[PDB]
Coordinates of C-alpha atoms and ligand atoms in Angstrom, one line a residue:
X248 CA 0.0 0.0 0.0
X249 CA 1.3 3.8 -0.9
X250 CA 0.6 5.4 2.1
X251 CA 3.2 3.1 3.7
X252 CA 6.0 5.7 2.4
X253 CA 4.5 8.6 4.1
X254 CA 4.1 6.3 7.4
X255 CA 7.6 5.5 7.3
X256 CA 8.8 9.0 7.3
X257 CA 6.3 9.7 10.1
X258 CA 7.7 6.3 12.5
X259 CA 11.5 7.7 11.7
X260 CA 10.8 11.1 13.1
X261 CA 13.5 11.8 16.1
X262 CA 13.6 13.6 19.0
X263 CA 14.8 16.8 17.0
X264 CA 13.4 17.1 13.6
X265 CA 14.5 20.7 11.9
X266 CA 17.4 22.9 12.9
X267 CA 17.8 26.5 11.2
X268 CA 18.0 30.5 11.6
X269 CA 14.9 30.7 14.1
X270 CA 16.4 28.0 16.6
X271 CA 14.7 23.8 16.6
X272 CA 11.5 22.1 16.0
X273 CA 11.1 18.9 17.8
X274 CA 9.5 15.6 16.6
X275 CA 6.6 15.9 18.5
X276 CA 6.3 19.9 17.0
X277 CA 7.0 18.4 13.4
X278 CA 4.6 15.6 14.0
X279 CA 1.6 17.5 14.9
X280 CA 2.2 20.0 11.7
X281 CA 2.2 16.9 9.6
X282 CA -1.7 15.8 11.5
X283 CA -2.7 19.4 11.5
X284 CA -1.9 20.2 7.3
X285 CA -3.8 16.9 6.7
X286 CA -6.5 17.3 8.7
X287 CA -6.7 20.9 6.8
X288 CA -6.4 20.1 3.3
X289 CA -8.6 16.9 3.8
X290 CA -11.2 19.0 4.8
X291 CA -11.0 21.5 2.5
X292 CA -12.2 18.8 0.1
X293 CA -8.7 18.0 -1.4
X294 CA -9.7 13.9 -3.4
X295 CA -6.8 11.4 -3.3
X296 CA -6.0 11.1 -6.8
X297 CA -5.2 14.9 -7.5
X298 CA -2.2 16.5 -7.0
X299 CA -1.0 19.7 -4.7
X300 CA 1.1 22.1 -6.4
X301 CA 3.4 23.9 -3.2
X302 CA 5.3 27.1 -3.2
X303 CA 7.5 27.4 -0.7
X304 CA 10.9 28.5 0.0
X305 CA 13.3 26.3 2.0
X306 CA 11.1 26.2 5.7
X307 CA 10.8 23.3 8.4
X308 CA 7.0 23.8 7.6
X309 CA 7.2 23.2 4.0
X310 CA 8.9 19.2 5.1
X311 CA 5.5 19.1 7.2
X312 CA 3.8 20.1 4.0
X313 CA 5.4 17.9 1.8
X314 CA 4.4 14.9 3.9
X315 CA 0.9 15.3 4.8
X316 CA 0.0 16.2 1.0
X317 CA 1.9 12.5 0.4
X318 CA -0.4 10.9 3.8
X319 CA -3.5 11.9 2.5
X320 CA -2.5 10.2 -0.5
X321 CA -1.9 13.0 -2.7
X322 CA 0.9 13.7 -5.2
X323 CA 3.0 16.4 -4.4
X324 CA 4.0 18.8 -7.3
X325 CA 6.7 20.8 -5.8
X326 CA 6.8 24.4 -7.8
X327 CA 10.6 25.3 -8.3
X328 CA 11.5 28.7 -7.2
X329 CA 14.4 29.2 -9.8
X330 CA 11.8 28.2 -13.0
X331 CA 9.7 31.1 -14.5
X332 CA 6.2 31.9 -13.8
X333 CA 4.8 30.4 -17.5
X334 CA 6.5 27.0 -16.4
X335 CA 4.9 26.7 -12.8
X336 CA 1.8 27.9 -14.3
X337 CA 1.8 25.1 -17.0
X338 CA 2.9 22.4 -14.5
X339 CA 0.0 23.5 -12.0
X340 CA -2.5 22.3 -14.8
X341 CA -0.4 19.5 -16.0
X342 CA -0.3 17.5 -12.8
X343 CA -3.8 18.0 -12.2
X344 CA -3.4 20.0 -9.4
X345 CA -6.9 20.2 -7.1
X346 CA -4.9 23.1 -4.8
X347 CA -2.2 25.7 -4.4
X348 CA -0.6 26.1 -1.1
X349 CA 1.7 28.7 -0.8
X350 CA 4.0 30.9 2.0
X351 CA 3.0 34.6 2.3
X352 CA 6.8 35.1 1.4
X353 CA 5.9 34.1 -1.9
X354 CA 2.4 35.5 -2.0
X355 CA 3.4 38.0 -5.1
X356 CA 4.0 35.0 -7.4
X357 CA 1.2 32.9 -6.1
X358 CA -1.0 35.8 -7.0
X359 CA 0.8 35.8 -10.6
X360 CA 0.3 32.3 -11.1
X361 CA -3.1 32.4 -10.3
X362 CA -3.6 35.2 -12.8
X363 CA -2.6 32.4 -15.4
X364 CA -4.2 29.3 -14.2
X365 CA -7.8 28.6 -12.2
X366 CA -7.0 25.8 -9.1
X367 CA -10.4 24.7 -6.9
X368 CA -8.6 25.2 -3.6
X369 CA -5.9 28.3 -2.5
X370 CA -4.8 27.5 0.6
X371 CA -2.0 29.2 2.5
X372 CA 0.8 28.3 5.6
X373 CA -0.1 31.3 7.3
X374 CA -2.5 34.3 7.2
X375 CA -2.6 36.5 3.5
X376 CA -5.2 37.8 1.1
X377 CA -4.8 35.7 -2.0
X378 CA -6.0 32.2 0.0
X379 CA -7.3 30.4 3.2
X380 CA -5.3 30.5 6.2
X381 CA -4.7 26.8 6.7
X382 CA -2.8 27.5 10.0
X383 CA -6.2 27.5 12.7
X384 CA -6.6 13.8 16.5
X385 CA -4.5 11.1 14.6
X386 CA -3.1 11.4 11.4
X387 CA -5.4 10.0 8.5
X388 CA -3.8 8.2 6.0
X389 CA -5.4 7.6 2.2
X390 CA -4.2 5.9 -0.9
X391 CA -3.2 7.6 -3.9
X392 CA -4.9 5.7 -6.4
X393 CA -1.9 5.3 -8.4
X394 CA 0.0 5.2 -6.0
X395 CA 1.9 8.5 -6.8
X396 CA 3.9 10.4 -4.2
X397 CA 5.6 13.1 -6.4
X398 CA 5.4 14.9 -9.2
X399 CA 8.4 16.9 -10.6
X400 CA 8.1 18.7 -14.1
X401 CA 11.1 18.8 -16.7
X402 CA 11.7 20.7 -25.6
X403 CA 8.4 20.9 -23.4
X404 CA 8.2 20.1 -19.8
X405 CA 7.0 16.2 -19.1
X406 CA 5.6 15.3 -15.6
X407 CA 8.1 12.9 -13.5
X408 CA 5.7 10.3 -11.9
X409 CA 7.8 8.7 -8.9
X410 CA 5.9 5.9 -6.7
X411 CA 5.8 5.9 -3.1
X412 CA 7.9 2.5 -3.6
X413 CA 10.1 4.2 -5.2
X414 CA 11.0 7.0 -3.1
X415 CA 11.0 4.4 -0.2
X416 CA 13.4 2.6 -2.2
X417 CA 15.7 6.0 -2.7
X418 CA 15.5 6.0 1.6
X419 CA 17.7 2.5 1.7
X420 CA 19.8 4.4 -1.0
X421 CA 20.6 6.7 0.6
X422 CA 21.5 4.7 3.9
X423 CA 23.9 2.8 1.5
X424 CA 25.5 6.0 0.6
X425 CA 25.6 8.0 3.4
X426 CA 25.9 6.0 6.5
X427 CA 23.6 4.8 9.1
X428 CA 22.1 7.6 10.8
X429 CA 20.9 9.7 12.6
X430 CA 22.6 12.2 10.1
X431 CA 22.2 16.2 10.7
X432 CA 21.6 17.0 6.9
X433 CA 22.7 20.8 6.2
X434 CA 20.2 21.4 2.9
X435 CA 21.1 24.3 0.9
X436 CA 19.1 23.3 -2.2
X437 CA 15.4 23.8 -2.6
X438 CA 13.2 21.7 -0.7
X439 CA 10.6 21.3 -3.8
X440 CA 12.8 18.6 -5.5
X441 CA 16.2 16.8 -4.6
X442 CA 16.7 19.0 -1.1
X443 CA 13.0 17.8 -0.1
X444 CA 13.4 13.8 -0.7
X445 CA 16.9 14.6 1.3
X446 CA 15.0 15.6 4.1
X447 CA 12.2 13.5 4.4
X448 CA 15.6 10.5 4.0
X449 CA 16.8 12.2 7.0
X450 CA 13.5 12.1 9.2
X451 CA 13.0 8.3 8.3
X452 CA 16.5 7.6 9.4
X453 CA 15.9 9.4 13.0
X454 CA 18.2 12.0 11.9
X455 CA 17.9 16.0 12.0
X456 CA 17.3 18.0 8.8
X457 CA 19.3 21.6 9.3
X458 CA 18.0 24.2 6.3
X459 CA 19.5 27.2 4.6
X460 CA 17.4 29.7 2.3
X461 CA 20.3 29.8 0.2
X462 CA 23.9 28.8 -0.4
X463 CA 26.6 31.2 0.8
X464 CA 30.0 29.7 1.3
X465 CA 30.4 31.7 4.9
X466 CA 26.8 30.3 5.8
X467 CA 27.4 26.8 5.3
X468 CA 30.8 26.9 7.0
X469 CA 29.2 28.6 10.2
X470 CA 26.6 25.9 10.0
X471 CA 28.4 23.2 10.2
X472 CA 30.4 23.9 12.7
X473 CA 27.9 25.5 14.9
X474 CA 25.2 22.8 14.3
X475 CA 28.2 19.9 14.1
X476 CA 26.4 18.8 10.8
X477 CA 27.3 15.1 9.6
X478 CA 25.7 15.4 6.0
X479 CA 25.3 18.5 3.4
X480 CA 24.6 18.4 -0.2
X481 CA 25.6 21.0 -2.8
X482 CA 24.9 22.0 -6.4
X483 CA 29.5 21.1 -7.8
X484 CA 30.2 24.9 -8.6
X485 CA 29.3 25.1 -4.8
X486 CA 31.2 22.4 -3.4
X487 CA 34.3 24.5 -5.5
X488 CA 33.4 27.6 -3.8
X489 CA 33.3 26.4 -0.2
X490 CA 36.5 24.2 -0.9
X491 CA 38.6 27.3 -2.2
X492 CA 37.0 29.6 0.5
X493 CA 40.0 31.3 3.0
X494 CA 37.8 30.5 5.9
X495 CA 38.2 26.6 5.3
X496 CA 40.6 25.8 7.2
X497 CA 40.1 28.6 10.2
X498 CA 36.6 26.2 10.6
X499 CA 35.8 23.1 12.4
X500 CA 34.2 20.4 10.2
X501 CA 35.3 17.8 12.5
X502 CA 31.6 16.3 12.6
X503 CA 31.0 15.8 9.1
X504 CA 31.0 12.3 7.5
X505 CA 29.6 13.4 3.6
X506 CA 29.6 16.2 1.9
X507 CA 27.9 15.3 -1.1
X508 CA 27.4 17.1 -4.5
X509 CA 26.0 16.3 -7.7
X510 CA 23.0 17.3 -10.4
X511 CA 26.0 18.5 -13.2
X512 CA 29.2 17.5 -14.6
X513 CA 31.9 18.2 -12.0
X514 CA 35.2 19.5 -13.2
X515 CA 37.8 16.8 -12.2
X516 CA 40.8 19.4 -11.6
X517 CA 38.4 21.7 -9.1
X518 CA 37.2 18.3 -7.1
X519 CA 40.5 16.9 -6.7
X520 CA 41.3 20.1 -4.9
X521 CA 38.2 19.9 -3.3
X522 CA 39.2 16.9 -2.2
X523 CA 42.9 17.7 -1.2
X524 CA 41.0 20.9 1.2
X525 CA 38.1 19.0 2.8
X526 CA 39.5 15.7 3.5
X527 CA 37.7 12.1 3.0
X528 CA 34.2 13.1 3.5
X529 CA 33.7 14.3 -0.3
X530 CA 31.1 11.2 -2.2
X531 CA 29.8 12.4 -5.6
X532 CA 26.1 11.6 -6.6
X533 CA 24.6 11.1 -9.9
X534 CA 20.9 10.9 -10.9
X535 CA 18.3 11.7 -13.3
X536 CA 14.4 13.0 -12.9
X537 CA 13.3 10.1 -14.5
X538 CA 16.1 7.8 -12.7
X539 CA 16.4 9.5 -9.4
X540 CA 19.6 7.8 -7.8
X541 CA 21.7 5.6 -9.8
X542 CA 25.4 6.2 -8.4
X543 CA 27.7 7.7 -6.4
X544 CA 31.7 8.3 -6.3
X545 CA 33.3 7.5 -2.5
X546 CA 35.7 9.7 -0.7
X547 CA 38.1 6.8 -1.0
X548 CA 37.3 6.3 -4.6
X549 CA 38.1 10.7 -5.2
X550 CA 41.3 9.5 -4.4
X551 CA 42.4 8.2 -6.7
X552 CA 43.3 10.6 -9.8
X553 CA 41.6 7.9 -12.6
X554 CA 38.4 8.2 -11.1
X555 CA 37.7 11.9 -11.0
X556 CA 36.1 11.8 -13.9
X557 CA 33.5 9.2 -13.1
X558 CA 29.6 9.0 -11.4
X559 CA 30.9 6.2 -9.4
X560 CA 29.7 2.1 -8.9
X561 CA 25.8 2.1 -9.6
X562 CA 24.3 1.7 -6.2
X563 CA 22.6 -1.2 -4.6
X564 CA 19.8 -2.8 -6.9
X565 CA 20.9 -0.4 -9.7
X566 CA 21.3 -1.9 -13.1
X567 CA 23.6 -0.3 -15.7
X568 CA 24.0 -1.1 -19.3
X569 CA 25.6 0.1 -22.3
X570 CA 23.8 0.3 -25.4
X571 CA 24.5 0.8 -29.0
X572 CA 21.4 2.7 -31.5
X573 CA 20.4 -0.5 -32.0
X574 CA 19.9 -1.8 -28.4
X575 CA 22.4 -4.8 -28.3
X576 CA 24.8 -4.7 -24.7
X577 CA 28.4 -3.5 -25.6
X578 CA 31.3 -4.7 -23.6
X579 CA 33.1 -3.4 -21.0
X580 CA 34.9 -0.2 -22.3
X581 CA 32.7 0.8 -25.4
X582 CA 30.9 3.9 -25.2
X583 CA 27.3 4.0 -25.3
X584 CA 24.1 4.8 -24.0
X585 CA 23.1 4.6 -20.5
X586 CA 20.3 2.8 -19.2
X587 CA 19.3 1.8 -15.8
X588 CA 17.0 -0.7 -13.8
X589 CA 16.3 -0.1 -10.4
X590 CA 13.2 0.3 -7.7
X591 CA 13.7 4.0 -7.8
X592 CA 12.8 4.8 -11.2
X593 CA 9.5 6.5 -12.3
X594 CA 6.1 4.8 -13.2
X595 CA 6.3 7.3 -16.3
X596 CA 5.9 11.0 -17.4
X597 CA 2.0 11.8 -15.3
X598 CA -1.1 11.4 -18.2
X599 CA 1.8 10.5 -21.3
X600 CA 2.5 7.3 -22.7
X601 CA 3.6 8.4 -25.9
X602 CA 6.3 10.1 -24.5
X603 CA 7.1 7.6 -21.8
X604 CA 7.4 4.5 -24.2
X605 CA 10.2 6.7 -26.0
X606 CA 12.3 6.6 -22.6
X607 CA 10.9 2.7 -21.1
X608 CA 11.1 -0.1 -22.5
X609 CA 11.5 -3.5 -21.1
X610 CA 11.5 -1.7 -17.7
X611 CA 15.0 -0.6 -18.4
X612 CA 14.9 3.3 -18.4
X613 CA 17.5 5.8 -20.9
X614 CA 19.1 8.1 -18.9
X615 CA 19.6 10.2 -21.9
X616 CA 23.4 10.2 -20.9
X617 CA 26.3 8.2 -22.7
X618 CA 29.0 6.6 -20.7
X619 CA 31.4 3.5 -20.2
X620 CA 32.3 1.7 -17.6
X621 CA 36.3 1.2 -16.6
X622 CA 37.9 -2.2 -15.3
X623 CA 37.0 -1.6 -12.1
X624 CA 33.3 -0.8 -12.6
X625 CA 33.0 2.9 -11.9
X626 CA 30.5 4.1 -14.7
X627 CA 32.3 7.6 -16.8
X628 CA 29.7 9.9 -18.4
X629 CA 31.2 11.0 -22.0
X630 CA 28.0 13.4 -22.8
X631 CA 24.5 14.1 -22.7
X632 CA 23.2 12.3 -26.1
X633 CA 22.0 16.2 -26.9
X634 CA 25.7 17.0 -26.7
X635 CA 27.8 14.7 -28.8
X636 CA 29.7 16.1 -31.0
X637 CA 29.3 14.4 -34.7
X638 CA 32.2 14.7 -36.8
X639 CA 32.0 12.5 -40.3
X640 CA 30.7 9.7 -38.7
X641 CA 33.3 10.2 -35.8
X642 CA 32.4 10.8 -32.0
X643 CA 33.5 14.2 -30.5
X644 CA 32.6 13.6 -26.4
X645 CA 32.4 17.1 -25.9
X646 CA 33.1 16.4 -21.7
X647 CA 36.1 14.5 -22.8
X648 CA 37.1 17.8 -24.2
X649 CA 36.4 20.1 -21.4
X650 CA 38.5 17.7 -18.6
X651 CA 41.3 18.6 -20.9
X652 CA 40.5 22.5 -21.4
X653 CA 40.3 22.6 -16.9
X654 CA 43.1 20.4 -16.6
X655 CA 45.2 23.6 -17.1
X656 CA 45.8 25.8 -14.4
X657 CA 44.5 29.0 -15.9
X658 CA 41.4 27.5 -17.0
X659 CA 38.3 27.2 -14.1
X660 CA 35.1 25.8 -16.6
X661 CA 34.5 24.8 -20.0
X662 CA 31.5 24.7 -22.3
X663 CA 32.4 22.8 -25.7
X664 CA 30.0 22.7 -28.3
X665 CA 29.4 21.6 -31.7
X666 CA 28.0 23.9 -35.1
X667 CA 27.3 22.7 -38.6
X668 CA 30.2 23.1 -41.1
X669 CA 30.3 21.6 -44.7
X670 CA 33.9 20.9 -44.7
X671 CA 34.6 19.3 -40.6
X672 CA 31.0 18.1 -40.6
X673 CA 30.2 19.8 -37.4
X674 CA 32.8 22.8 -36.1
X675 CA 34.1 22.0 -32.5
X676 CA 33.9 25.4 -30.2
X677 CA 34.9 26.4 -26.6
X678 CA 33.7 28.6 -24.1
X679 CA 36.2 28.7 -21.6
X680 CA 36.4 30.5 -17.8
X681 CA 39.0 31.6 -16.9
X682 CA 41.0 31.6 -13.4
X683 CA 41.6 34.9 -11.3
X684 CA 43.3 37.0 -13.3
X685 CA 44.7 34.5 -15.6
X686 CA 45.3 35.2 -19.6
X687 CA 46.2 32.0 -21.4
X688 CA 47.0 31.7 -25.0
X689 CA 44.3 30.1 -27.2
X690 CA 46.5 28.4 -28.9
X691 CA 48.0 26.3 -25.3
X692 CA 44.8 24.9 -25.3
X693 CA 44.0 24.0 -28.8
X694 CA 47.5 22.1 -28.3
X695 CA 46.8 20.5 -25.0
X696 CA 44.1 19.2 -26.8
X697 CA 45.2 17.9 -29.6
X698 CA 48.1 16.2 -27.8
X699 CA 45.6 14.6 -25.4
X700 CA 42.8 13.5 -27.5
X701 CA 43.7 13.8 -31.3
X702 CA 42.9 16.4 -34.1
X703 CA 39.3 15.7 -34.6
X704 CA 38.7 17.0 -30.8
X705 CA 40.6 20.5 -31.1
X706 CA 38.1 23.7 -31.1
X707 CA 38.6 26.1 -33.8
X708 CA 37.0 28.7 -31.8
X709 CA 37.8 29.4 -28.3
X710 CA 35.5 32.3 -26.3
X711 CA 36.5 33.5 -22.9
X712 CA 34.0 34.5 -20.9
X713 CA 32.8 35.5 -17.3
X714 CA 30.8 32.7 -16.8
X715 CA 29.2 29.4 -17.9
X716 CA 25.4 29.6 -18.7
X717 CA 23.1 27.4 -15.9
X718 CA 19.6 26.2 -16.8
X719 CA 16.9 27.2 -13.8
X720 CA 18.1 23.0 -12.7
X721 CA 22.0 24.9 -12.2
X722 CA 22.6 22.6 -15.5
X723 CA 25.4 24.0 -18.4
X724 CA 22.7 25.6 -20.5
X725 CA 25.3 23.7 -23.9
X726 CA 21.8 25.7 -26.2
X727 CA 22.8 29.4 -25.1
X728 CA 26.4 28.1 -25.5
X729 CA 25.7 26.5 -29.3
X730 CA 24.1 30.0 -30.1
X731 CA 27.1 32.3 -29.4
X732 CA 29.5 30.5 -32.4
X733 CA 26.5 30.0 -35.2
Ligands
AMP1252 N1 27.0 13.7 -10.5 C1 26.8 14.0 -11.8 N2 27.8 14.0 -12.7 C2 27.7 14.2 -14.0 N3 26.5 14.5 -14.6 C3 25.4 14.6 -13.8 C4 25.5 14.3 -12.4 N4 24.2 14.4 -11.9 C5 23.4 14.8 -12.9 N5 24.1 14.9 -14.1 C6 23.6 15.2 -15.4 O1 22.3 15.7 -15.4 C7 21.4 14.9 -16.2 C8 20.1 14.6 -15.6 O2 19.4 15.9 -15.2 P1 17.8 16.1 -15.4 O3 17.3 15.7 -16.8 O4 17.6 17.6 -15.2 O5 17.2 15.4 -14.3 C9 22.2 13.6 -16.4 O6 21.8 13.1 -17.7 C10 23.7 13.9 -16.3 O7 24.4 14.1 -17.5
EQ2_1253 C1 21.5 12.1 -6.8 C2 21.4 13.3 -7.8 O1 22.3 14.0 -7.9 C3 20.1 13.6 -8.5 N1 20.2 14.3 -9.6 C4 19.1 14.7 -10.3 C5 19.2 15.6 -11.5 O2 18.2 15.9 -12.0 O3 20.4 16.0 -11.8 C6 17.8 14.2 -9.9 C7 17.7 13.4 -8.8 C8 18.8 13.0 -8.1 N2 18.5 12.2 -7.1 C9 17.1 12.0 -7.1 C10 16.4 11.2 -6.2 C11 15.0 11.2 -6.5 C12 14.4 11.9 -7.6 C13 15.2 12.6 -8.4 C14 16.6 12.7 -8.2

């Protein structure tokens, strides 16, 4: 039965359940949010099957939120607070949403989106003029009919349908990543999608969750000292920040066991420093939306220069394959397409088959990522299928040629990409960051290149600029790149 994900969060609970700015919320505090929010938005005639689109920003009572909407056997639709207010809007209709609840911090966009899209129910965690105060007896469990407990929203943006299985199946994942708890989790990243599953991980486990509105690298390194956290997870170009920060080593980190990052490429020159600075706590995690957890990289395994530029061994009851266009298996060493069977991947994209079909088949699930695996079993990404570089029936990996590009010392981030040319077949191009104050010669690079991977990889063009384009996910936007060299 679906509710029995919920219920498990709910029996983990501890004696302290949030830490933040305002001081702790106990178990017993957290507890009788979760009853109170589902007695609410029960009776404010809220039907299992529906969803309940939530705006929040990163609060102890958006965890309670989360959980309730999921006990009363309703998907939650987390609304991202980095994507714009045409993309909520669409994903509020999408996932068939029967209410809005939102924070009166948020209030103004609430009112925007609401402008946009009609929604039965407007409830909201506190009083305001746009919805009902839900703020003013047991817990009441119902079944999602479908036994949905989130959905996350992406071309066009697809619905993510995850099961409650499956998200109790990412609980025992992350157990076999990040220790036994209880863990004091320091989250950082928004509570609407990875930093959200994170926590409720961390209240099934007996642990403490400990939330930041925002990353700053003097925040996080005052937080875990003063709150003695165990476990934090960051976006890579923030793992880099805090590692090169001159407070580092001023601070006490004594206490923690992970620090964890993932959700984009990391560069392998910036980690192994990271790893040098912060010491054998650093693990690397890769998923996808449609995937959710399929690996992770081990501070003992960051040790070892060969392996920076891998995701890590699949975890526990995560199958990996390699795949040609066909679909035959290659061998160990070929490069190919990833695909993964596990417990935690979705049901399919909410009310489309058509386009699930194109991602599922045989219950085997394509990342959308191309890879290899090494002799020892650590899975390396090459590209995003998207991102592949085709030269004449050749394979530029354009990642392959952005390790090289930050290997040097005056380079911080690359973004190589490829453009239509009659004579090369596609032109190779590279945005590159630069370090400090740093002025390297084109040219150094094109050669580092070429003596590292060959003449097909070498960019003819090579930009330097400020920054690398992120996505609202904190993703290399490679599109904005591709447009700056056509
Ligand atoms: N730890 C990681 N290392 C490298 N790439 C990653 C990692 N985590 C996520 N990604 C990338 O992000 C993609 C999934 O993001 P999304 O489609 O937004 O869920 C994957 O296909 C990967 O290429
Ligand atoms: C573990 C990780 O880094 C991760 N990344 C993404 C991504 O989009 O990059 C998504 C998920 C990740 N872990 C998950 C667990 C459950 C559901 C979704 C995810």
């Amino acid at each position: 039965p679906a509710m029995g994900y919920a219920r498990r969060v709910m029996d983990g609970i501890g004696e302290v359940a949030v830490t933040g700015a305002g001081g702790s919320v106990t178990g017993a505090r957290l507890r009788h949010q979760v009853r109170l929010l589902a007695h609410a938005l029960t009776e404010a005639g809220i039907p299992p099957g529906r969803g309940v689109a939530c705006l929040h920003a990163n609060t102890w009572r958006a965890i309670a939120l989360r959980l309730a909407v999921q006990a009363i056997g309703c998907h939650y639709v987390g609304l991202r607070p980095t994507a714009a207010v045409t993309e909520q809007a669409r994903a509020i209709a999408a996932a068939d949403s029967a209410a809005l609840v939102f924070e009166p911090s948020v209030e103004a966009r609430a009112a925007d989106l609401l402008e946009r899209v009609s929604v039965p129910v407007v409830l909201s965690l506190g009083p305001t003029s746009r919805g009902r105060d839900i703020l003013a007896t047991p817990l009441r469990y119902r079944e999602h009919p479908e036994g949905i407990a989130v959905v996350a929203f992406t071309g066009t943006p697809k619905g993510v349908a995850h099961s409650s299985t499956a998200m109790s199946a990412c609980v025992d994942a992350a157990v076999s990543m990040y220790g036994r708890g209880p863990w004091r989790f320091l989250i950082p990243i928004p509570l609407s999608d990875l930093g959200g599953e994170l926590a409720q991980c961390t209240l099934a486990t007996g642990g403490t969750v400990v939330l930041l509105e925002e990353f700053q690298p003097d925040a996080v390194l005052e937080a875990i000292e003063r709150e003695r956290a165990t476990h934090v997870f960051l976006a890579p170009n923030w793992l880099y920040q805090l590692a090169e920060h001159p407070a580092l080593p001023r601070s006490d980190l004594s206490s923690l066991r992970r620090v964890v990052y993932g959700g984009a490429p990391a560069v392998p020159s910036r980690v192994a420093a990271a790893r040098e600075r912060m010491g054998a706590v650093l693990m690397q995690n890769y998923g996808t939306q449609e995937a959710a957890f399929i690996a992770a990289l081990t501070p003992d395994d960051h040790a070892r220069r060969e392996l920076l530029t891998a995701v890590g061994r699949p975890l526990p009851h995560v199958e990996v394959e390699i795949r040609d266009d066909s679909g035959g298996t290659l061998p160990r060493g070929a490069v190919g397409e990833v695909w993964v069977r596990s417990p935690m991947t979705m049901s399919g994209y909410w009310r489309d088959p058509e386009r699930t079909a194109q991602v599922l088949s045989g219950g085997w699930l394509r990342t959308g990522d191309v890879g290899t695996f090494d002799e020892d079993g650590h899975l390396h990404l090459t590209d995003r299928l998207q991102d592949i570089i085709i030269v004449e029936a050749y394979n530029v990996y354009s990642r392959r040629v952005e390790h090289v590009l930050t290997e040097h010392p005056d380079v911080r981030a690359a973004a190589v990409v490829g453009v239509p040319d009659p004579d090369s077949g596609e032109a190779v191009c590279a945005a590159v960051v630069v370090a400090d104050g740093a002025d390297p010669d084109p040219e150094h690079l094109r050669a580092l290149v070429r003596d590292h991977l060959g003449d097909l990889h070498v960019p003819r063009r090579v930009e330097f600029v400020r920054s690398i384009p992120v996505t609202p996910a904190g993703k290399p936007d490679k599109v904005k790149v591709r447009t700056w060299f056509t």
